[PDB]
Enzyme design. Structure first.
Site, short mmCIF file in Angstrom:
data_model
loop_
_atom_site.label_atom_id
_atom_site.label_comp_id
_atom_site.label_asym_id
_atom_site.label_seq_id
_atom_site.Cartn_x
_atom_site.Cartn_y
_atom_site.Cartn_z
CE1 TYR B 118 -12.29 -26.82 -7.82
CE2 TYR B 118 -12.58 -29.12 -7.17
CZ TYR B 118 -11.88 -28.15 -7.86
OH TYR B 118 -10.76 -28.53 -8.53
CE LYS B 163 -10.87 -11.71 -16.70
NZ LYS B 163 -9.70 -11.25 -17.54
CG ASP B 194 -6.19 -12.02 -17.48
OD1 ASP B 194 -6.08 -11.42 -16.39
OD2 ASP B 194 -6.75 -11.50 -18.47
CG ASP B 218 -7.37 -27.46 -9.35
OD1 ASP B 218 -6.79 -28.34 -8.64
OD2 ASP B 218 -7.73 -27.62 -10.54
CG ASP B 222 -1.54 -28.74 -10.88
OD1 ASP B 222 -1.70 -29.02 -9.67
OD2 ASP B 222 -1.67 -29.57 -11.79
O1 LIG Z 1 -10.08 -36.23 -8.74
C1 LIG Z 1 -10.53 -35.07 -8.92
O2 LIG Z 1 -11.33 -34.71 -9.83
C2 LIG Z 1 -10.04 -33.97 -7.94
C3 LIG Z 1 -8.60 -33.57 -8.29
C4 LIG Z 1 -8.14 -32.51 -7.33
C5 LIG Z 1 -8.93 -31.17 -7.41
O3 LIG Z 1 -8.85 -30.35 -6.45
O4 LIG Z 1 -9.61 -30.98 -8.43
C6 LIG Z 1 -6.70 -32.24 -7.72
O5 LIG Z 1 -6.67 -31.71 -9.06
C7 LIG Z 1 -6.06 -31.28 -6.69
O6 LIG Z 1 -5.48 -30.25 -7.07
O7 LIG Z 1 -6.20 -31.59 -5.49
O1 LIG Z 2 -11.52 -5.07 -19.34
C1 LIG Z 2 -11.91 -6.22 -19.02
O2 LIG Z 2 -12.37 -6.57 -17.90
C2 LIG Z 2 -11.79 -7.33 -20.10
C3 LIG Z 2 -10.33 -7.76 -20.24
C4 LIG Z 2 -10.23 -8.82 -21.29
C5 LIG Z 2 -10.98 -10.15 -20.95
O3 LIG Z 2 -11.23 -10.97 -21.89
O4 LIG Z 2 -11.29 -10.33 -19.77
C6 LIG Z 2 -8.75 -9.13 -21.40
O5 LIG Z 2 -8.29 -9.66 -20.14
C7 LIG Z 2 -8.50 -10.10 -22.57
O6 LIG Z 2 -7.85 -11.14 -22.40
O7 LIG Z 2 -9.02 -9.78 -23.66
MN LIG Z 3 -5.48 -29.81 -9.15
MN LIG Z 4 -7.18 -11.59 -20.44
#
Ligand SMILES: O=C(O)CC[C@H](C(=O)O)[C@@H](O)C(=O)O
Ligand SMILES: O=C(O)CC[C@H](C(=O)O)[C@@H](O)C(=O)O
Ligand SMILES: [Mn+2]
Ligand SMILES: [Mn+2]
Lengths: 329, 329
Positions: B118, B163, B194, B218, B222
């Site tokens: 951001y 990550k 992930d 963000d 959600d």
């Molecule tokens: O209007 C926007 O693009 C901001 C949305 C805003 C964000 O933090 O991205 C909303 O998704 C939130 O989680 O507050």
């Molecule tokens: O060993 C790593 O940092 C790669 C992991 C790899 C990635 O795409 O980040 C794994 O999380 C995947 O979804 O393939």
């Molecule tokens: Mn949001």
């Molecule tokens: Mn992964």
């Protein structure tokens, strides 16, 4: 014959790849498998996770089959085996299919596999750290084409997930995805990365071919696995222009290494995607898996008392059955 | 008195803020509310989504209460009202609490609110688009302090999600988070963005204070809302060094504007966080909400036949009850 390079890696990698290879051998005798080491052990010796000589054979191979590798956070200078193989082999599309094994419903995700936040440009200087999320016209064009082929083949549409309001690169990416899917007659619904997470857990099957930037894809594809028995059954392919690599989406699970209870399904279904890529018959493996799963004892990660070997043997059982028929009659 | 700037915005914003303000007025008569326009209408007139004169009053106010604003993707040059207010007012911490209203269990997320993806540095040039994920020592230090205060107050720990294998800025961020939580005696479990998504849908309540970079926050916040009736009940605060702003995590839901059935709970619980910030009694509002929810008719988004007004009136009912006691006996 087809030459397939096989990299079992560590943890449960060897176990599930033994399973997958044995299943492949039961559907076709047209594939020669050559094994290669890779990972920390190889890094310790030569300073890379794959030897240059091994890497050269691997790129002359027709496809690659890959298990799972431990990537430790505390090994200075180590780069991921799989990230290394992805870049070295030109693997720009990453396709993950999350299956509901009963119904054959599928969450289909296309993760751009070569750029975005994975491009590799990053720096720390003067208490400011930075990473560059890069989208290129070439990267977006080919990942879009790839996604449209998946939508066409399924008589389906694309859901392009992004955060265009905040990211210049996604505004760009979205326009290019829309161009090429227009040219090719594919619908493109779009979705914002935050709110889509809610849609993905609540309404899993209604999104068609989900497409996104690399890291977003990484996140969304793990999230999508909640809709499957366990992450243990989920397969994938990493596609480039002259070669492809196939791996289960699970990782090393070293916790359960050597205990004979890993779930080989994801690797097996990945060997299936590998056969499709070679023009051989992966639908066989998929049917075998569906069928074994109706009443077969599943591994502990799916809530069952079965051993790895039981599941492999059972699927090979279903294959031998389908195979001994003439297209099924 | 306390001066509170109120920005209802559009869509269901006005409706739920009417609800929240009425609840606030029922727990304290110590707050003067001044209203301000903002959004596309104001952008149309003056080229900004908030007028400079209005912005000046707003920063001299003690707190801000904010509904929801429509941010359309197809309005060239428009920046988000809320993003604008976040930057203009120095709002670097974004706290989202996802409540299970029965049990009073809480998913607690701290989203760094001023940098990361951001930060705003982005460019397209020669078919290459770029966005810079920036982490600074100052940004990471203060967002960490903020997270440790939340963990301390709850006798709890931090789960730092990242990550690091791929992102230089997260390697940096992780080290700083670990430094300051060491100095202050707080445990720091870490999690990868992930795989954490799976942990978040499966084991929601066991993560303590979740902390992360802006965009990751963000996404995760959600996602965490799936564990609540609807996103409709989830509140938040955006904190800076001299002022704060409070908004429900839901958005405009223009689909249901003016239909008298929006869920005011999220705004109400956000007015609660606002009272806490001012040193007034938000625990009252929270108890009122718990209590109304045992047998009260809920709005359609939570599977009930109730109107907005019914829920507001019902909560004010519970407040008047708790209020007419002397600390509860
Ligand atoms: O209007 C926007 O693009 C901001 C949305 C805003 C964000 O933090 O991205 C909303 O998704 C939130 O989680 O507050
Ligand atoms: O060993 C790593 O940092 C790669 C992991 C790899 C990635 O795409 O980040 C794994 O999380 C995947 O979804 O393939
Ligand atoms: Mn949001
Ligand atoms: Mn992964």
């Amino acid at each position: 014959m087809y030459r397939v390079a096989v990299i079992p890696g560590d943890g449960i990698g060897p176990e599930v790849i033994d399973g997958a290879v044995r299943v492949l051998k039961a559907v076709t005798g047209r594939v020669r498998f050559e094994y290669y080491e890779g990972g920390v052990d190889v890094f310790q010796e030569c300073g890379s996770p794959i030897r240059e000589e091994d890497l050269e054979e691997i790129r002359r191979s027709d496809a690659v089959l890959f298990g799972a590798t431990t990537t430790p956070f505390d090994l200075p200078g180590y780069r991921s085996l799989i990230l290394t193989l992805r870049k070295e082999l030109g693997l720009y599309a990453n396709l993950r299919i999350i299956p509901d094994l009963r119904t054959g419903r599928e969450i289909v995700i296309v993760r751009e596999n070569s750029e975005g936040l994975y491009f590799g440009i990053g720096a720390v200087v003067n208490g400011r750290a930075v990473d560059v999320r890069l989208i290129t016209r070439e990267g977006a064009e080919r990942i879009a084409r790839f996604a449209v082929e998946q939508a066409k083949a399924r008589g389906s549409f694309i859901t392009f997930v992004h955060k265009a309001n905040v990211l210049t690169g996604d505004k760009f990416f979205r326009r290019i995805v829309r161009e090429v899917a227009g040219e090719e007659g594919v619908e493109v619904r779009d979705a914002i990365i935050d709110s889509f997470t809610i849609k993905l857990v609540r309404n899993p099957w209604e999104h068609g071919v989900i497409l996104s930037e690399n890291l977003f894809g990484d996140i969304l594809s793990d999230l999508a696995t909640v809709h499957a028995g366990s992450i243990g059954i989920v397969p994938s392919g990493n596609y480039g222009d002259g070669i492809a690599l196939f791996e289960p989406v699970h990782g090393s699970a070293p916790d359960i290494a050597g205990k004979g209870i890993a779930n080989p399904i994801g690797a097996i279904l990945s060997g299936a995607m590998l056969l499709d890529y070679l023009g051989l018959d992966g639908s066989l493996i998929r049917a075998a898996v569906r069928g074994y799963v109706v009443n077969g004892e599943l591994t502990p990660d799916m809530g069952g008392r079965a051993r790895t070997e039981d599941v492999v043997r059972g699927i090979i059982g279903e294959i031998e059955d389908l195979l001994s028929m003439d297209e099924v009659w």
